[PDB]
Write a protein that binds this ligand. Structure first.
Ligand code: APR
Ligand code: APR
Ligand code: ZN
Length: 707
């Protein structure tokens, strides 16, 4: 295939910096890890002088790849395995197209992810056996893919051992399961021979792990390899960001059965691990991937399992250090102060996402293979999921009946916080009949299936500031207020200095109205101080100006009629319908509002990109109604010197046929320029931004509706 060097890139360094190190057995390399002798071709040439500093974003550039083919190991396995050298920023849409039809990989039905320890790992004889049986049983059925880092060390090798065993002893024989290995190109020992500008496909890879020094050897039982590159040598952890994006894309943005979308189930299992495992778990849970932690594995598994049920407030700095000096004993001397306060924020973030985290207890709980824990995680993540509706949870039940677990399917039926209708069990009963399992059909037909701790700003203290490759300083819930001393505080200053005087803070400084609703706020030097605590950044970021940013997000409401005009009281209480809008390229709807333009009186988005030639009328009507909230939101764009403040005016229509009040509003509400407009029912799982669902929850209780 020659589609590569055409659609897949690799990264290199253009000039050498001469960093002051020795890099084990060597005399300086550049700053990257590669020696001046082999550091491309024009780096040693004096291409003028770009300075004396190293910045990755500045002088690393993409090039067509030269490392892809069919690796065949020397003598331990005479087989063919496909591999490719992708870069760090290749979009997660050409990688899927490369896997589907350039290797011959069919669409999977499960996306198991295995993360854990490396170069420091020793399973107990019983943990190894239970993990082997569970993984073999789970991968034996369905079409599961096993995403795992590729190297000949630790759990990444002891997963390949089980794959090899199941592929050597099987009725269908050969290999019926697909195990993908994503690793970092820099940390590969014998990279030579694996690089050819056109492509070879013997790609012989002699495996020696005696003189590896510091570079891990590639595994020899995985089926496919995706080696990411960043232009760096000997630096692990590059593959952590790309792996989660690819997993999310394959899980929720590739299947189109039923005409809308389907989320392919995905789970991430944890077996021990270190610094690189906590980051992977945080990234996966942030994207929405369920995580299961095997208790007893050690060093990350015990640490996260021992605080998996405690309230987020009491997980403090000194609580980590007490649980970080028993599982990390030889490595405790490495642990510094600026790194413990980072291991704490990540653990707090993982714990507070309690709907995407299960713990596989060892002795007296889940006393079976890991499939029970996987089922529990999938069924708990499908019920608390936001975008895909009630039709998504209907298929993990089918997976459960495929795995012969009847107690797990019984638990979902009898849950008091899950409103399921009786005709919603057909896709599971259909599979129960096919598989000849009387237990499930007997369970179903019985249930009417007749045939005929602390409250601080959370999103403001969120990693990965939007639309920027920057990171915030880790600020745990303990030390967010501006009074508590945080001596390590050294946050970045990203803002898409110091003569900022003549700014009348706490007053209407010209046509800006810099007046916070939560009383007067303080100023440090020439910049304000964020109320409600710290964020982890500084400056202003992607915001108008320092201080409070004012907006006028409205909400509009009608009672949910169905067919007759009587208020359609639902199964529990009244439900009401909110009118929302969608951005042209976004995964969430938004409330019909925005910034208050000077002298506009309308929030610049109900006034533009929306209905026109009627602004004065509804403007004279909007100023009649009860406010439900006024002030600061937990918006993810906040910083230590800038924030967003809002007014929430609720307008309500009692009658659907109330003359032109609702008819003219509905008949005229047409963007004619924008992407899409719609109405939505107000439930606890509406796909809005969290800042908007907060207003919905705080205002739907003012009319008697059920959120
Ligand atoms: N993915 C890796 N493969 C091999 N060796 C590695 C890896 N990451 C770091 N190392 C090296 O091994 C030691 C670190 O071992 P651990 O602390 O156990 O590694 P951890 O930080 O848990 O990272 C393990 C990695 O494997 C996968 O789970 C995932 O890619 C994760 O980052 C150091 O010498 C380094
Ligand atoms: N309430 C919100 N919560 C989270 N992210 C938000 C929110 N509002 C906007 N965003 C994000 O802001 C980005 C969109 O920026 P613009 O298109 O400029 O829109 P704006 O409404 O001005 O913000 C996307 O990452 C999204
Ligand atoms: Zn370099």
């Amino acid at each position: 295939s020659s589609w590569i060097p055409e659609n897949i890139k690799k990264k290199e360094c253009v000039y050498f910096v001469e960093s002051s190190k020795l890099s084990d057995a060597g005399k300086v390399v550049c700053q990257c890890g590669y020696t001046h002798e082999q550091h491309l071709e024009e780096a040693t040439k004096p291409h003028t002088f770009q300075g004396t500093q190293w910045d990755p974003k500045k002088h690393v550039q993409e090039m067509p790849t030269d490392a892809f083919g069919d690796i065949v190991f020397t003598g331990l396995s005479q087989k063919v395995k496909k591999y490719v050298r992708v870069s760090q920023d290749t979009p997660s849409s050409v990688i899927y197209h490369l896997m589907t039809q350039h290797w011959g990989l069919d669409v999977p039905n499960l996306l198991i992810s295995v993360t854990g320890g490396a170069k420091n790992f020793n399973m107990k004889p019983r943990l190894k056996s239970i993990f082997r049986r569970g993984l073999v049983k789970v991968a034996q059925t369905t079409g599961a893919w096993i995403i795992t880092g590729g190297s000949h060390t630790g759990v990444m090798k002891q997963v390949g051992e089980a794959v090899r065993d199941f592929s050597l002893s099987s009725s269908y024989k050969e290999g019926e399961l697909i195990t993908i290995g994503v690793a970092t190109w820099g940390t590969v020992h014998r990279r030579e021979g694996l690089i050819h500008p056109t492509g070879s496909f013997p790609a012989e890879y002699i495996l020696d792990e005696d003189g590896q020094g510091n570079l891990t050897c590639l595994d020899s039982n995985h089926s496919h390899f995706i080696l990411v590159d960043d232009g760096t040598h000997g630096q692990y952890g590059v593959e952590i960001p790309l792996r989660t994006r690819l997993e999310k894309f394959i899980s929720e943005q590739t299947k189109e059965r039923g005409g809308v979308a389907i989320k392919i189930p995905i789970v991430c299992v944890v077996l021990e691990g270190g610094p690189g495992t906590l980051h992977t778990i945080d990234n996966a849970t942030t994207n929405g991937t369920p995580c299961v932690v095997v208790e007893g594995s050690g060093r990350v598994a015990d640490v996260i399992a021992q605080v998996a049920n405690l309230p987020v407030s009491d997980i403090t700095i000194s609580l980590i250090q007490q649980k970080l000096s028993v599982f990390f004993q030889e490595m405790f001397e490495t642990f510094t102060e600026s790194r413990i306060v980072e291991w704490t924020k990540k653990i707090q973030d993982i714990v507070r996402r309690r709907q995407l985290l299960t713990v596989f207890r060892e002795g007296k709980d889940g006393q079976q293979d890991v499939d029970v824990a996987i089922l529990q995680a999938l069924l708990k993540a499908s019920r608390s999921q936001d975008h895909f509706g009630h039709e998504n949870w209907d298929h993990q039940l089918k997976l459960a009946v495929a795995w012969n677990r009847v107690d797990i399917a019984r638990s979902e039926i009898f849950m008091d916080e899950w409103q399921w209708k009786p005709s919603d069990l057909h896709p599971t009963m259909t599979a129960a009949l096919i598989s000849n399992k009387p237990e499930f059909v007997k369970l179903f037909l019985e249930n009417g299936v007749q045939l005929k701790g602390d409250s601080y700003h959370v999103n403001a203290r969120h990693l990965l500031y939007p639309n920027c490759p920057v990171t915030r300083f880790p600020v745990p819930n303990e030390k967010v207020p501006w009074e508590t001393e945080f001596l390590i505080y050294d946050p970045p200053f990203y803002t898409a200095l110091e003569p900022l005087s003549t700014i009348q803070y706490n007053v209407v400084d010209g046509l800006r109205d810099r007046r916070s609703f939560h009383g007067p706020y303080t100023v440090q030097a020439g910049l304000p101080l964020n109320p409600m605590g710290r964020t982890g950044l500084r400056g202003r970021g992607s915001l108008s100006c320092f201080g409070p940013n004012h907006t006028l997000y409205p909400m509009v409401t009608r009672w949910r009629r169905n067919e007759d005009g009587a208020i359609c009281r639902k199964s529990i209480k009244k439900m009401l319908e909110v009118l929302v809008v969608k951005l042209p390229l976004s995964e969430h709807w938004a409330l019909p509002g925005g910034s208050r333009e000077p002298g506009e009186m309308l929030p610049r988005k109900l006034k533009r990109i929306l209905r026109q030639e009627h602004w004065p009328s509804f403007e004279n009507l909007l100023k009649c109604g009860m406010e439900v909230y006024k002030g600061y939101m937990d918006d993810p764009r906040n910083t230590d010197n800038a924030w967003i403040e809002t007014v929430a005016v609720s307008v309500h229509f009692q009658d659907q046929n109330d003359v032109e009040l609702n008819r003219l509003n509905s008949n005229l509400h047409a963007c004619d320029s924008g992407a899409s407009i719609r109405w939505q029912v107000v439930d606890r799982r509406i796909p809005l931004y969290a800042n908007h669902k907060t207003l919905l929850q705080k205002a739907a209780a003012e009319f008697g509706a059920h959120y």
